[PDB]
Symmetry: D2
Subunit: 311 residues, 4 copies
């Protein structure tokens, strides 16, 4: 009898709780397994469509969600009244989708908020007003899935980070990395140096230092799948960067769908997650599709990076 994700979730709630969160996590597990099946058999943008359809179908039928936000879509979806729960969920169903052809890691990301007290959502207008009142610091849960040689699911509910691995023989996520802690330092950096010429001078200096300083040798790793690179960062330590550049002034990653959920996971594991001006989680949501640069990882590595920006 191994410890399943479902068991872990049930145990970690107060005795005789409402159970909305359990149903939500059932729906997410199912979605992840359906996406994994499709990825395994790829050889024999279609994957994007399927992944989106799956997440929406299972989440809407869970009875747990009020509002759904998929990164691929322009508007939020409001659940129908009869099966309307109290969670707002924003997800990237399949990050790094081009990578499938070369058999490299891809991933899914989600962040979960709760309806503020004395608030209802009967339309997209209501939902738009509600998200403007929220911040990453109000997020009750976040997680991601990594589809590689194993399928991992990493999750937080505000009390640290736990990693699960899909046992394909029983179709259940099993606990394999309890209490993930990102090391305070580690000499690995992860960025696309192809964009060097577009970067801000302070960040060029930081990267040049990593390569040319006399004291500490650094290794570079850039898979080109944000989930894969962050997952490695969490377990090994290091830094992952999507810096500001001249062709993408507001940054690369979407706040709601990618950067804020990942920031919550990284902070809960003991790392740092910053944007252009402090913590990602402290930024206001003005826009459903707003963006930010990111500097994530081991807390002393992010401090060294910010020291070049400062001054």
């Amino acid at each position: 009898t191994p410890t399943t994700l479902t068991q872990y979730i049930i145990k970690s709630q107060p005795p005789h709780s409402r159970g909305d969160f359990t149903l939500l996590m059932m729906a997410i597990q199912t979605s992840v397994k359906v996406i994994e099946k499709n990825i395994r058999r790829a050889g024999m943008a279609k994957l994007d469509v399927i992944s989106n359809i799956a997440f929406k179908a299972y989440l809407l039928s869970s009875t747990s969600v009020c509002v759904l936000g998929s990164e691929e879509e322009e508007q939020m979806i409001i659940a129908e009244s009869g099966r309307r729960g109290d969670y707002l969920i924003f997800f990237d169903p399949l990050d790094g989708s081009s990578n499938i052809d070369a058999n490299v890691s891809v991933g899914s990301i989600w962040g979960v908020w709760r309806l503020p007290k004395d608030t209802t959502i009967n339309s997209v207008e209501d939902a738009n007003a509600v998200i403007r009142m929220l911040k990453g610091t109000d997020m009750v849960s976040a997680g991601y899935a990594v589809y590689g040689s194993a399928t991992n699911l990493v999750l937080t509910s505000g009390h640290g980070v736990d990693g699960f691995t899909l046992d394909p023989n029983i179709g259940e996520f099993i606990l394999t990395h309890p209490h993930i802690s990102i090391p305070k330092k580690r000499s690995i950096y992860s960025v696309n140096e192809g964009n060097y010429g577009k970067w801000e001078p302070w960040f060029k200096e930081y990267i040049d230092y990593l390569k040319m300083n006399k004291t500490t040798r650094y290794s570079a790793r850039y898979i080109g799948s944000m989930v894969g690179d962050i997952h490695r960062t969490l377990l090994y330590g290091g830094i992952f960067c999507y810096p500001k550049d001249a062709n993408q002034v507001e940054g690369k990653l979407r706040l709601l769908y990618e950067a804020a959920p990942m920031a919550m996971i990284v902070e809960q594991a003991g790392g740092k997650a910053v944007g252009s001006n402090g913590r990602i989680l402290e930024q206001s949501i003005t826009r459903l599709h707003q963006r930010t640069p990111v500097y994530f990882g081991s807390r002393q590595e992010v401090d060294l990076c910010m020291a070049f920006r400062d001054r």
Copy 2:
């Protein structure tokens, strides 16, 4: 997006229900998948022990059960107060276990009752008093799993019978036979004719008639796994019998763990399920391990069988 068992259960409950039954059925699905894994790899009893351990671990951690009864054990188990639900569940974790060596069907069976109103169970004594007040007609749910070349799960909640099949690629039970209806007649009988000499004379006459009547030709099938034989009976029609014998005066099958759950499924599919004196479901529970003979299946086939007894 296929229809999962979990989705079916959630949809079939009132909007915003308590959700105890969903958690129970999650625990049962997980147990069935764990048992299937072990059966698939047999060779490369022990299976009885593992199967019992699995059912108990997942059911007790579901938060849905007050009291657990395993066929293999002398006493019922009371769930601890912090995670105590309102279902009484009696299960046979692995019927036909010897059959594994020859790669023939095996199965699991369960029946679920609810705490009567104004009743509590804080001990085995309480639980013993409670089951004496219950009958099969008070049973809220029943089901079985068949472990063969496919893994099937057949289930009722009082509104007919539905069959699911395990999709090993996603580890979910998928709906495959909605609204199972047992034919009113079919010329198949299922009994161990090796025990011929120990049977009551009326049942010898019935069996002799099936073989020697001039009007209707009958086929015999006896797998020797009760779940496998009942599963065939449900889908094809026919009759399944464990008649009274001179060496086993009170019958072979245990009422709570096997006969009553199977009787509820057979009745809900439109068949008949009788013992020595009428419906199995109408018998009083006096004893935890009490037994009964059974005559199950197509309603006209069971009527013909009872006509020999009545003469």
Copy 3:
């Protein structure tokens, strides 16, 4: 590192052999796995068609076969000259196919013969003449697959019987039952007693004796899948019967596709396999689709059965 079926076959041939048999067994393993995949996902006669297609496609491309005979087809198939080997293979791609709906055992069966020396086959006429010269005693290999909760492959090449189990994690058959020996006696019988009224009197007497004798209690098991019932018989012991009955004027099982391959397996495991007049393997093949009754299993159980037939003379 577990012992695969392929490894077992390679090891059991003379050093630096031709290797036709290895390629044949690869093709059969592949066919079995493809059929298993389809059976596992049934629900979510189509199975018959797929199974037949699979066996033919993989066997013909193996380069090992001269002639193919599928139970479902009226004629044999001759491999094209460029990829023509020296094995004649007769197979039942999917026995008990109706059973799939109720999730009971199904199976595949095959028997392999070799071209007699100084013989060629360039047509169906040639192939028809060749099979008339052969008997079950000339069969070089036989096996079956059982598709249940596990997938088993049981095989003989004339030196006993070995059982393999499919490891779904690596897609290989692994050795699990080396040197299968059927017990000399065991009180289990397997027959469809629904057909009682159509049986010969001596066989009714035999069945009545199993039920009513004062000395030995017998259990009845009849799955209704020949491969499943035979597989149980091999491992537990007992008897399996498809006796002669008034409806069937020559018996139920086809000699080439089912009865002779199963007979070779049962004999190689230490049992007996008889028809209406002695060993199944000693019967002449007059007809591609000829049939026979069968009495298979533990040697003392088959002797008791034949004793009832002998006393009725």
Copy 4:
């Protein structure tokens, strides 16, 4: 009926051939599947040991190999006389093994030579003399496996490159990428820029040019698994580099076990594969563990790289 790797191999040999190569490829397929099983369940250097054991056991029992060379071992292994074939096989059983912990791509690589005519090998001394007479241009076959979200097997026998994917439902490699052709140009480069300060000046200039030239924008990808990075390079195009270090010692792959097999694949797909002085495949083998830098990929990308080296 899909086209299996085994079928493809049999069809691609002359009618009624000896069949040694088929048995060899069976043994390799089995080894790859065994390694995949172990990788899938990681979590739930041990992998290195298991992988080595698997390759050796299955290859030695194939009857197809005369001599075995594993990258991990100091000496070659001679097959015992009774089961001695005519292939010399040099393999890296598991490249990138550390990566398993972070769920990133790993791989296996092999290259196959044939006994020269009128030559025998009854000892390690004989085998040592034989390899000194060979070059990469005499190699009869090469391939690799990539263990990611799918399991790929890419193979050449001197007539182009074909890619297969493992169907986990039937345990067979299925043809999915026939006739792989690497594009003549593509703006992707793959190197570890953490080693910048140890590189030769010409290669620093080349890398600086890729980042800062006014004409062509380049993307960087470095998974940190040689097989993963080469696999992407083959399918998408680009360049993969393990440059020579200024110290002339570091920045080298092993010729026999990694560089020459990968060079044969890249050339057969229409790319270029060069070392310090021309084609990898034209280098003489002076010893078993000899090394070389590599510049592999799209033919115009490798030409641009060599132009910086030339002046």
